[PDB]
C-alpha cells in the first residue's frame, strides 16, 4: 500500500528500497511522515538541575557496617558459556542479585543460563528476550524494562545497578567493591566522552533519526537537538544507585518523558540517555565522571566500520586484552573495578592471570586450567541452523573417528570396535590448549556391530600443519570471516565449500619494505590468480580476497608466495565437496553443477597459462578427466571422495565413549584430558561456601 | 582514553 505522505528524503527512500518485509516498509513510512509533520520528536525540554554546569564530585580496606547489596544485570550473547560461568564465579556473593538477559538469537547460551538460575535463589533470568543488535535502540529498552522488573521484586533490596557483558571481568575483589560503593552510596558513576562535545554529537549521529526494525537500524533523516537541555554522553557501562533508577523509571516530569521518546529512535542510546537525564535532573549533583571501568580502546584497530550491514552508520569496538596488558590492572590513579573486553578463544592466559591474582591459585593437580571448550553446535537447535558445509564436514569428522576406532584394535577374531554411523552430530566443540587451537570435538551416535548396540562417542579431530617455508614472512593462512580488529579468522577450522570466497592472509615481522608475489593454484594445477603486494616497512598483517568465479573446483588448493620468482613459502587449504543440499542428500543434477569448477572455464577473465611451465605446475590430462568423473558422483562414491580429502588434511587424534562400551581399547570420556566431558573446575559452579562465595 | 562507539557515515 502507498504511504500516508509523500516521501522524498534520500535516506528514507534508500531504506524503503532495502527493507525486505512489508511490516518494516510501513513502519519506515509511518515514522518518516510523523516526523515530517513535526509531531514525533520534541523540540524543547525543561531542565531541572540548579547547577549552571556539571558536577564531577571526585581507602577500600575497611569493613562497612551497612554493606550495599548489588543488582548485577548481565546482558549476554554468543557461545562462550564456560567463560561466562567463570566470570559469574568471580563476582558471585550470596548477598547480591543477578538478573540475566540472553539475546533472543542465542538459544544455546540461554539453556546453559537456565541451569544457573535453578541452582541459586538470588539468580533469575528475564522471561522477555530481545535481539539486541549493536547500536540498536532495543538495548535501552532492555535496560529500562529490567530496571522496572528489578524495582518491583520486593524480596531483592538492592542499592546499586551494575551492567555487565560476557566479555567483562572484575579487576578487584568483591570485598573492595562493596567497601567502595558503601562509602559513596549516593553517587552515580558515568564516564563522559572526554573530547569536544559538538563533534561528539556528529560522530554518534544524535542529530539523525534512526528506526529499529527487522534487526536493522535504518537511518531516515535529520532532526534537531532539543533546546533547553545539555546533551552529554560517553560509555554505556555504568553504575547507578537505586534512587536514580527509581526516578528514571517512574518520573513523569517533562525531562524523562521527552527523553524516552527522543531516545526511542536513537543510535547507541545507552551511550547518552543516562548521561543526559542525570545532568538535567534534580540528581545532577551526584554524578562522578568515572564508570570504574578500563576499556581497551585501540581505534587504530577497532574502527573499521564493521557493522555497516547491521546499522546505517559506522562504529568502533574495544580490543581484547593480552598478557602484556596485565600491568594495566594495577594502576592506582583512579578507582577501577571492572575491565573489558576478554575473549577466551582469543587469549585465555590473561584471564587466568587476573583470576589467580584476585582469588589465588587453584590447588596443584587441578585439571583443565589451560584448556578451553566452546560449543558451536547443539542438537536442540536443529541441523537447519548449520550450513551444508559444516554439516557435510562434521559428518566426515565423525566417520574419520570411527575409522580410528576400528584400526586401533589389533586382533584376528571379530573386531569389537567396528561402528556404523547413526543420525546427525549431537554437538560440536572448539578445543583450545594454552591459547592454541587444537581442533573440533564431535559427539555422535553409532552402532557397535559386534554386539549390535548403540553407543555415544566423542571424536577429536585436528588439522594437519600445511604452512611450509631471512625474510619477514612469519605465517600464511587461507580462511573466511577475517576479524580485522583481532587479526584472526573467526571460521577457526577453515571449513570451506565450493561457493565460499576464500581470503589469503600473511603475517610479517619487522624489516625493510619488500614486494612479494602471491599465486593461487586449484586442485588440478590450474592457476586461478596472481598479484603482487607491497609489504610496508611497518605492516604486520596483510590480506586480500581475490575475485574468483564460482563454484570453486573442490580439492586441495595451494597458495604460494615468491620474491622475484624465488620461492619463499606456501600453504594449502581444502575446498570440500558437499554431500548435503538443503540438509538433504545431494542429487546428481545438483552435485554435477556444483563440483565441476566455475561456469566460465576459468576463475578470472585474465589467464595465467603462461606461468604453468615457469612454476613447474604441469596440468595432467588424467587428473582433469578424473576430476570430471568425480563431479558427477553421489552417495557412496561421493562419500569416499570427500573422506579421502578430509583424511589428507585432518587427523582423528582420539575417540572416547561417554557411557558403557564394548570396544576394549576405548577410553571413557570423563577420564580423558581433552574431552568436553572431562573435569573443568575453573568453570564449574558448586555449592555456596560459608563466606558466601563460589570461587 | 576517549569514550563513544560512533564514527560518522
Ligand atoms: Na533462581
Author numbering:
A (entry chain A): 253 to 310, 317 to 727, 734 to 959
B (entry chain B): 205 to 213
Text lifted from the article:
The first enzyme in the pathway, peptide O-xylosyltransferase (XT, EC 2.4.2.26), catalyzes the transfer of xylose from uridine diphosphate (UDP)-α-D-xylose onto serine and thus determines the site(s) of GAG attachment on the core protein. XT1 and XT2 are type II transmembrane proteins consisting of a short amino-terminal region facing the cytosol, a single transmembrane helix, a stem region required for Golgi localization (Schön et al., 2006), a catalytic GT-A domain (Lairson et al., 2008, Müller et al., 2006), and a unique C-terminal domain of unknown function, termed “Xylo_C” in the Pfam database (Finn et al., 2008). XT1 has a two-lobed structure, with one lobe comprising the catalytic GT-A domain and the other comprising the Xylo_C domain. To better understand the initial step of GAG biosynthesis, we have determined crystal structures of human XT1 complexed with UDP-xylose and various PG-derived acceptor peptides.
To obtain defined complexes, we used crystal soaking to replace the co-purified ligand with dodecapeptides derived from the PGs bikunin and syndecan 1. Finally, we also determined the structure of XT1 with a peptide derived from syndecan 1 (peptide 8). Peptide 8 is derived from syndecan 1. Peptide 8 also bound identically to the bikunin-derived peptide 1. Both peptides have glutamic acids at position −2, and their side chains assume identical conformations. The side chain of the glutamic acid at position +2 of peptide 8 is not visible in the electron density, whereas the side chain of the glutamine at position +3 is well ordered and packs against W571. From these experiments, we conclude that the peptide binding site of XT1 is promiscuous, except for the requirement of a small amino acid side chain at the position following the acceptor serine.
